[PDB]
Structures are given as C-alpha cells and as structure tokens.
Design a protein around this nucleic acid. Structure first.
Ligand SMILES: [Mg+2]
Ligand SMILES: [Mg+2]
Ligand SMILES: [Mg+2]
Ligand SMILES: [Mg+2]
Ligand SMILES: [Mg+2]
Ligand SMILES: [Mg+2]
Ligand SMILES: [Mg+2]
Ligand SMILES: [Mg+2]
Ligand SMILES: [Mg+2]
Ligand SMILES: [Mg+2]
Ligand SMILES: [Mg+2]
Ligand SMILES: [Mg+2]
Ligand SMILES: [Mg+2]
Ligand SMILES: [Mg+2]
Ligand SMILES: [Mg+2]
Ligand SMILES: [Mg+2]
Ligand SMILES: [Mg+2]
Ligand SMILES: [Mg+2]
Ligand SMILES: [Mg+2]
Ligand SMILES: [Mg+2]
Ligand SMILES: [Mg+2]
Ligand SMILES: [Mg+2]
Ligand SMILES: [Mg+2]
Ligand SMILES: [Mg+2]
Ligand SMILES: [Mg+2]
Ligand SMILES: [Mg+2]
Ligand SMILES: [Mg+2]
Ligand SMILES: [Mg+2]
Ligand SMILES: [Mg+2]
Ligand SMILES: [Mg+2]
Ligand SMILES: [Mg+2]
Ligand SMILES: [Mg+2]
Ligand SMILES: [Mg+2]
Ligand SMILES: [Mg+2]
Ligand SMILES: [Mg+2]
Ligand SMILES: [Mg+2]
Ligand SMILES: [Mg+2]
Ligand SMILES: [Mg+2]
Ligand SMILES: [Mg+2]
Ligand SMILES: [Mg+2]
Ligand SMILES: [Mg+2]
Ligand SMILES: [Mg+2]
Ligand SMILES: [Mg+2]
Ligand SMILES: [Mg+2]
Ligand SMILES: [Mg+2]
Ligand SMILES: [Mg+2]
Lengths: 114, 54, 46, 118
RNA sequence: GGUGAAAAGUACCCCGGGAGGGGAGUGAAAGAGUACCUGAAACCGUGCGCUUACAAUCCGUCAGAGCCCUCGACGUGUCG
RNA sequence: GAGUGAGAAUGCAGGCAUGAGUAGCGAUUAGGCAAGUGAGAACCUUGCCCGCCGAAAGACCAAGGGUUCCUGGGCCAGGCCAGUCCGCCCAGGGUGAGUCGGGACCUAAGGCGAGGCCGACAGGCGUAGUCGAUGGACAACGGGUUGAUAUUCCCGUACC
RNA sequence: CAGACCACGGGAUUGAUAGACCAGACCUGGAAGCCUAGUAAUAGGUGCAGGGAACUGGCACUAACCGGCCGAAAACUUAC
C-alpha cells in the first residue's frame, strides 16, 4: 500500500463515455504530467477531469500533508449519473427522445516512492 | 436500411474501441525563469510570449 | 402553399358559441353545466 | 498569387476576396493580427504582393494597391512607412506563427505580423 | 409517499468561478447528507486471475493439456 | 381461505441497451479584425470595415398573445454548440384622454323574444320590443419630455 | 501532380521544401501620367506597353524550430 488521497466530482454535465475518452489518456501517471496532458489535449471533457485530479492533489497537500511531486494518479474512472429526458420534434408529427447525460469522476492518487 | 439483429457485446466493444484520443506530444520551454510543457507546435509562440501559460 | 390550420382564436366568438349564457339558455346546456359542476371542473364553460 | 485549390475560404469566391482585403487592411494598420491558420496562410502572399506594390514608388503602383485595398489611411501608411521600411528586404516581409487553438470550434489559430528586423 | 429518536440538516479549514468533493465535527449509524429506510435486476465502469490475432463457433455438452487459487498428508515439493 | 406461481397476448407501466458517439444541428445574406469584459468569448459590449433587405427583411396598427416592455441581478434547466448573453430565471418598476378606439348615440344580417299562436309532454316559430358593427352621427393639432406612456403628461394655440 | 481521413513521396539550416523577391516562358493586347490633333465623342506618341496564377531558373528574405516518443537476443538435440 501507499498513502492515498481521494476526490470525487458528481453530476458533471458530461457524458460518461466522453469523460472516459480523456480519462484513458492520464491513468497511472504523475499528477503534473497528467495535468499537462489534460491542459494541451483538445477535448472539452478535459476541463472537469483536470479539476478533479488537481482537487485530489490538494487533499494530499492539506489533509495527508505529503509531498507534491510523489503523487501518481493511481485510480481514475467515470461512472454514469442521472439522465434527463427531453423531446425533439421531428417530421410529420414524430417526437424523438434526447438524453442529457452526466457523470461522476473519481480519482485516488498515491504518494509512491521516486 | 435497418439493423437486422441487435449487435453483440464483443462486436459493440470492438469498434467502440477505435473511438479514442491520443495524447499530444509535449516539450519543455522556459518562461519567466520557470519550466513549462507545451506542444512543439506552440514552441516558438511560447518563446516569444503569445500563448497563455496559466 | 395554403397553410391555414383549423383553430383561429376569437374571444368574442368563442364566448358566443361556447359561453355560459348560451349553455344556460337551452336545456342540454344546463345539463352540461350541471354535469361539469358535479365532476369538479374548475372551468364549467368558456 | 496562386488560387485556392479547394473550396474558397469565406464560403464563396467573392467572400474570399473581400475577406483577404479586410485582413490585409487590418494587418497593415496594426502590424499584427490573430486569425485562423488557413486564413493566415492565404493572407501572407496576398499581403506581401501589396507590400511589393508599396515598395516601388509610382502613381501606377499606388493605383493598383488602391484598387485592391480601399482604405486611404492604410494606403498612405503603406507608401509612407512600410514601402520605405522594406527598401532593403527582398521578399518575405511577413511572419506567421502558430498559436493555441480556439475554444468554440477548436479552430487552429495563428498570428501574422510584419517583420521589424531589417 | 419513507433522513434521523431528535435537524443535532455538516461550524471552521482546504481544491474549485460555482457544482462537487476532502479534512473536521453531529449522530447509534452519514454502507442515514434534506439527490436522503432497505437498495434487487437490466445497463455502465475500474482492478486482478486464466485465456485469445492460420481461424468457419445455436455459442453448449462430454473428454482434456497447461496455468492460477484453496483444503489435507507426508514433508520441505509431490500425491489425494 | 386464496387477487397463490408468466417467457411469449405486434400485452401494460417504468428503468435501460442496439443502431452509435453514427444521422442531424432547420434555407436560398457573410462575415472579419482591433479593443473590453470575464474563471472561461467564433457567438456578449465598443469601434472600423465588408456584405444583405430596401413595395422590405423599414414604419404604424387590428385580431390574437399576456408582462414577453424598462431597470437591477442571474447563469442550474431552456437556446439544436458555448454563453459573461437572451423573448429564459428572479425582484422592483412601468400603460395618465372631454377630442384617439369603444360604451353612455343609431341601426343591418342575425340573436333572443312580454303577451301570442302551434305542438301528447319535451318543445317550434314569432309580434311588440330589445340587443347586435364589419356601417351612419359626433369636438385637437404641432413641438418637447421618461430608462420604460403619450393626439393622454407638459408647452403653444384650438374646438365641442 | 500523393490524398476522403490515414497511407504514400520529398525537405527540414551540412537547407531551394513552400511563400515572397528577381529574371525568363506564357496569357491578354497596347496601362496610368503626360504631350499632341479635333468643337467633341475619340485618335496618335511615349511603348510588344501594363497587368498577371500554376511552368523553368536563380535567391535563405519568411517559415521548416534552443524536441519529444518509441525501438536490440532463453535454450536444447543430433550431425559437424
Ligand atoms: Mg483543456
Ligand atoms: Mg408540426
Ligand atoms: Mg422515436
Ligand atoms: Mg394547397
Ligand atoms: Mg481550382
Ligand atoms: Mg467539393
Ligand atoms: Mg463549409
Ligand atoms: Mg459577384
Ligand atoms: Mg462521532
Ligand atoms: Mg445502519
Ligand atoms: Mg436515488
Ligand atoms: Mg438509500
Ligand atoms: Mg494461434
Ligand atoms: Mg467444415
Ligand atoms: Mg395472478
Ligand atoms: Mg417478467
Ligand atoms: Mg413482453
Ligand atoms: Mg417500454
Ligand atoms: Mg448507445
Ligand atoms: Mg453507420
Ligand atoms: Mg458516415
Ligand atoms: Mg454529418
Ligand atoms: Mg439555424
Ligand atoms: Mg477578443
Ligand atoms: Mg442590394
Ligand atoms: Mg425602392
Ligand atoms: Mg415592419
Ligand atoms: Mg428585454
Ligand atoms: Mg446555463
Ligand atoms: Mg446550451
Ligand atoms: Mg444582464
Ligand atoms: Mg432580460
Ligand atoms: Mg370636456
Ligand atoms: Mg330584429
Ligand atoms: Mg313565454
Ligand atoms: Mg324565436
Ligand atoms: Mg347598442
Ligand atoms: Mg366600427
Ligand atoms: Mg415605447
Ligand atoms: Mg404629441
Ligand atoms: Mg517524412
Ligand atoms: Mg514573373
Ligand atoms: Mg494606355
Ligand atoms: Mg519559381
Ligand atoms: Mg523502450
Ligand atoms: Mg525461448
């Protein structure tokens, strides 16, 4: 085991499968490397996930009191959240359904040795 | 046309797999005496201060 | 290119065709009003 | 210069022409503008040929550039500053540098400026 | 329709523009946090174990090598 | 003692997959740059250009709508993207008439209709009447003012 | 001049890869300004002029960067 800090972001207005597509870029990396990768990656879902990673780092800053530079994003994933249902009217009186999906991004970072 | 059968999990996950992103390749630059990482495309523009390193 | 739909609003005509006074003057209309009152409608009539 | 090979830049042939003219006017006015990368790549040669017109001082060249540009303050500043400024630079008056992508449509952005070294 | 016995409904600190969380506290419990008793299945992830890129498979069943885990014994790796 | 056993009724309800991160993102005008704001800006504000309408894509109304109008604030839902913006959310404010448009004036088609006649009853027509504008009669014009009303407020001069 | 994307091919400062610049080939057909003739529309001269994309050759003037990521070996048997 290694000392760990957690951060959760729930009900983020981003599809889970669109959050995972940038989560898969940064899994198992140092926090600073992950933050850089997210900051230059051209998909909008980076904005939530990046924040979540940073939030976790701060917890290890301020609640475990451990070294900034040893942090690695050990576990990160995106669960589905509640879906809102809407209607788009279509041709000849049809009415199709629209899903406004959300996500829960969870990150656990560990202070591994160098 | 219309799908004849519901498609299986193996075959669904086979081409959901191709929908991925690639991480940009970063290089190091020195701004205001401290080191930052930027794409090699934006290297010059960082070297003369036209990209906002937050 | 005719695109005229069936409902054309007119407050006075709606009153004079479906209103309280017209429902009352006849007998089937008083029946309708009493029926709607018994059912519990918040709006008996136009 | 050489035409656009694919579909024209502003959505039509006539919009690309006026779009180039406005971009060149702004570049000569301010000396540095930020636009999209394809627009900047199209604006480089088009603006440099106007600078070549301004470098050689004749009424005929002034008439050609007024034909293309339609802004008299910018024509005056071309023939009073930019032409004489580049009397010893043989071509390559501009500079395109790529900048960070846009946010709304993730459009590849770039900056064109005028060279101020010689 | 259902928090808890009682709002005691999370003071204060930290990341974040907020939303959301992490400490700290309340509580018998926060695997009770005003998205709240229990919280099944479909559906969606993440981690590990075995397998799979010369192969024509109603997707099982019977025989079965190899690997992995576990229970006994003798002992110290090989039978049962 | 049974509302006692579901896998099929193109069964009913709810939640969720497959297609698939795919089609589409709603005309025939078209946007650009500089600056500002802001956590964040292709879309908001300002300037300078470019373009489109111009017997309209301008100005004023009726019907219909109903607070959508103005000011301040907001940015969770809505906006086919984002949004600091919004016809969206919130609070406060705002509609001033002797002359405008109606009633208090008049009737048309028609409606209802004291008594009435007809009809087993329920009712049908209808006189006198009384409603009923899309019509007839009837006295105000120009300028200024508010963030939001203006022949209405004010100013000047009128008319009934 | 390779092409839906990708791939392919060339170049990347020890550099002519693309743009600009200079020159040529080519296309149009005789620019503007001036002078002149005519009342004028107009005509003549300056003068194969002016303008101009793709083709060719020169020219480092402008960009090809004070750069990142991948990516190299069990042995055994017999013959020799
Ligand atoms: Mg980002
Ligand atoms: Mg319809
Ligand atoms: Mg449907
Ligand atoms: Mg028709
Ligand atoms: Mg072409
Ligand atoms: Mg085409
Ligand atoms: Mg297009
Ligand atoms: Mg045209
Ligand atoms: Mg306690
Ligand atoms: Mg319990
Ligand atoms: Mg729930
Ligand atoms: Mg529960
Ligand atoms: Mg095989
Ligand atoms: Mg066979
Ligand atoms: Mg039953
Ligand atoms: Mg069932
Ligand atoms: Mg069924
Ligand atoms: Mg259903
Ligand atoms: Mg799906
Ligand atoms: Mg398809
Ligand atoms: Mg397709
Ligand atoms: Mg499409
Ligand atoms: Mg549209
Ligand atoms: Mg700006
Ligand atoms: Mg026009
Ligand atoms: Mg006209
Ligand atoms: Mg109008
Ligand atoms: Mg408004
Ligand atoms: Mg919103
Ligand atoms: Mg939106
Ligand atoms: Mg506002
Ligand atoms: Mg508003
Ligand atoms: Mg009066
Ligand atoms: Mg009458
Ligand atoms: Mg009677
Ligand atoms: Mg009658
Ligand atoms: Mg009347
Ligand atoms: Mg009238
Ligand atoms: Mg007004
Ligand atoms: Mg007035
Ligand atoms: Mg290559
Ligand atoms: Mg040439
Ligand atoms: Mg001539
Ligand atoms: Mg050449
Ligand atoms: Mg390696
Ligand atoms: Mg081996």
């Amino acid at each position: 085991e290694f000392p760990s800090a957690t951060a959760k972001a729930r009900y983020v207005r981003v599809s889970a499968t669109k959050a995972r597509r940038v989560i898969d870029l940064v899994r198992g990396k140092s926090v600073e490397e992950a933050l850089d990768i997210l900051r230059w990656a051209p998909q909008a879902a980076s904005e939530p996930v990046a924040k979540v990673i940073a939030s976790a780092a701060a917890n290890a800053q301020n609640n475990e009191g451990l070294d900034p530079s040893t942090l690695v994003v050990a576990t990160v994933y995106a669960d589905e959240g509640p879906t809102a249902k809407r209607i788009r009217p279509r041709a000849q009186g049809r009415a199709f359904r629209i899903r406004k999906r959300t996500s829960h991004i969870t990150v656990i970072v560990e202070s591994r040795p160098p | 046309a219309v799908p004849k059968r519901r498609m299986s999990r193996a075959n669904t996950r086979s081409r959901r797999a191709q929908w991925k992103a690639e991480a940009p390749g970063l290089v190091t630059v020195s701004v205001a005496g401290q080191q930052r990482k930027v794409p090699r495309r934006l290297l010059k523009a960082a070297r003369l201060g036209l990209v906002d390193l937050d | 290119a005719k695109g005229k739909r069936t409902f054309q609003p007119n407050n006075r005509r709606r009153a004079r065709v479906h209103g309280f006074r017209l429902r009352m003057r006849t007998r089937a209309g008083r029946a309708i009003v009493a029926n709607r009152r018994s059912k519990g409608r918040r709006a008996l009539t136009a | 210069p050489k035409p656009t090979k694919g579909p024209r830049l502003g959505g039509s042939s006539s919009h690309q022409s006026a779009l180039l003219a406005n971009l060149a006017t702004s570049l000569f006015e301010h000396g540095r503008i930020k636009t999209t990368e394809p627009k900047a790549r199209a604006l480089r040669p088009y603006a440099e040929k106007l600078i070549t017109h301004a470098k050689k001082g004749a009424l005929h060249n002034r008439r050609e550039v007024m034909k293309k540009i339609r802004d008299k303050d910018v024509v005056h500043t071309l023939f009073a500053e930019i032409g004489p400024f580049y009397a010893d630079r043989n071509g390559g008056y501009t500079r395109i540098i790529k900048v960070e992508n846009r946010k709304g449509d993730n459009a590849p952005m770039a900056v064109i400026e005028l060279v101020r070294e010689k």
